[PDB]
A paper describes a structure:
Functionalized graphene-on-gold grids improve the reliability of specimen preparation and enhance image quality. To address this problem we developed a method to produce multifunctional and ultrastable graphene supports with tunable surface properties for cryoEM.
The reconstruction reached 2.1-Å resolution (0.143 Fourier shell correlation [FSC]) from 41,202 particles with standard data collection and processing. This includes complete aspartate and glutamate residues, for which densities beyond the Cβ are often absent from EM maps. The decay rate of high-resolution information with fluence after the first 5–10 e−/Å2 of irradiation in this dataset is similar to measurements of radiation damage in 2D protein crystals. Adding a graphene layer to an all-gold support reduced particle movement by a factor of 2 during electron irradiation. Compared with graphene-on-carbon supports, graphene-on-gold supports reduced particle movement by a factor of 3.
Author numbering:
A (entry chain G), B (entry chain F), C (entry chain A), D (entry chain X), E (entry chain B): 2 to 171
Write the structure that this text describes.
């Protein structure tokens, strides 16, 4: 690549893999989104929360491919593994599943950051600082907040709490 | 009729009958509407949901008579049978009664569609596709959603749930 | 009924019956409306006159049910008898049929008024004065005017007169 | 009185007495209003409902005195009896107390109406029809609705229901 | 054709033929239009009715050729047969001639629809449903209405009726 400068094939492969992790998450959020939209689930606020997250993840993916091309790296796409469940249970279960997903998305970003530090790729680290690290952190505290709120409303009347959470916070 | 073309007396009679089914539904929705408006029921959101549906049904009826005249068919009106209950019970019971009504309204439309296919009346089918099939489908998923939400809020505290459903979703 | 005050079961039953008379009239005006819309009748001004009256009648009906609920009375709906003709003849015949209908609607209102006076229900009478008595009176003089005009234009050339009446007054 | 015409001293005295009944109700609604405003009651929606009713009642009073002067009658004011309770209990109790008050205000109006009919005072009856009969009827159905809603939310969790009613309907 | 998919040479030839039927109708409506514009006919409302229909028909033709190209079919144009009369008689005769034309245009569309059904060309049928079936139906009821109106005004004074129809409905 005539424009490739200080872009180790190590960081190239790691950004291809987190590109896949990000499209995989966007795929899972789509499954969650359409399950809270099921006639027998009917939590339109929860479906709307996961549909927005499926798009935020696709966009992280495109941002990472755009950056891969900018550094002269080559996008290599892998098969997208299907969501890991077909039905998500209640909003609590769905909320817990999503924050596992974001924390593993976040640990993948932290790993790429450390990889950019070993290889001394200031542009790569400055990239993950601006557009991914802060976003994941805000998203996970946001989901931890929702989880704490759903857990407090779920103690006694679950149906009522799930309805109230969907109606009052989402 | 000087303008009647490919309009079988079979589809004529079937559209007169679904015209009646549609005015009958509009009549039932009026009864439901005024029952949630009773001083001892007082669920103004539920009364407002059924008053709007009584008008959506009257308008399907007029749309069908307008189309009957456009094809040169002759409107023949029958006595409108009275709603099948005087008091509707709770919002759950009323919601379940309405979706029976919409599904039988929808099966009547599907029957007319099949009748338009046997007789090869592309204009009649294109008509029921545009203005009735999609509308019934959206309406029934909308009512299935409400039912799932009322059933989840009704498990423990029914009074509270009925109040919350009426206040938060309608 | 915890809010029912000075609302005799006599006036309750009489308002349920005039509610039916009003939905019945709205049904008849719908039949008249769709008959002047027939391809072989084609008097769009006459169809438009009777479609507007079918809605004015439905609204009297809803006004009466709204008032029945306000006084703590219970709406009881009866089967709606079908219009009393399928084809209405000429605009003259249709106009004469409508004013019979309005005058019997008006005599039903006058009867309910007398019933509200025997039982001393100032709220019921004040109600029929504001929203029905004046409306019927204006409507019947309006129809008597149309009848006098159609009869004057119908003497010699009927086709021409019917066309002119529909074109110039409706 | 040089302008007094067909204004029986019977209707004069009865309008002076309903003027007192109306200032008395306005006084009671003020007491209810300030009790839901107490730091240990704190239901600002209920306090706001009764403060608005205390003013609607004062204005009925002024309307009646204005009409008494218009007919040449003489306002005679009596001592205003104090509200009949100092603390109103819960919103349910307060709501039940208010609708007793409105129904006795309404029966006082109906009595004055009958009195205006015996003495044949068309102006007096036309007056109570326009500004009091309809208002009381709408107000009592409004309070019957609130009572039905508070009673449904009060079955199990009372604190929660009282909070929800005040937050969602008032 | 590299883009031709499921487009039978049967439907190709049938759309070329209805393209011709549509340009032929547009040609006939042009002849009718210029005949009501003749100094010795002078019915500018009737000339304006047929000039607008000559353009609506040309546009159906272009819509059909545009669709033929979209499916990869090949437009094949045939000689346009001249209108079938040079003088159209009265507005009644001209109106009757036009509705024969529209009904045969409509039966040609219904035939193409059946042809699209045998060959299972959902795109072709969905095409004729959206842009031709509904249009022809509305147009023929519109012409049946005009015919009923002209026939009613033509009974006695024909000159007067023809003038009035042209002045009041067109």
């Amino acid at each position: 690549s005539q424009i490739r400068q200080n872009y180790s094939t190590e960081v190239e492969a790691a950004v291809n893999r987190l590109v896949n992790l990000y499209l995989r998450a966007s795929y899972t959020y789509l499954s969650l989104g359409f399950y809270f939209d099921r006639d027998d689930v009917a939590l339109e606020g929860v479906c709307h929360f996961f549909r927005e997250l499926a798009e935020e993840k696709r966009e992280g993916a495109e941002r990472l491919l755009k950056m891969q091309n900018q550094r002269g790296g080559r996008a290599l796409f892998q098969d997208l593994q299907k969501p890991s469940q077909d039905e998500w249970g209640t909003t609590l279960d769905a909320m817990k599943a999503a924050i596992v997903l974001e924390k593993s998305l976040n640990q993948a970003l932290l790993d790429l950051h450390a990889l950019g530090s070993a290889q001394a790729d200031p542009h790569l680290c400055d990239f993950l600082e601006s557009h991914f690290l802060d976003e994941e952190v805000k998203l996970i505290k946001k989901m931890g907040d929702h989880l704490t709120n759903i857990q407090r409303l779920v103690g006694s009347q679950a149906g009522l709490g799930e309805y109230l959470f969907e109606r009052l916070t989402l």
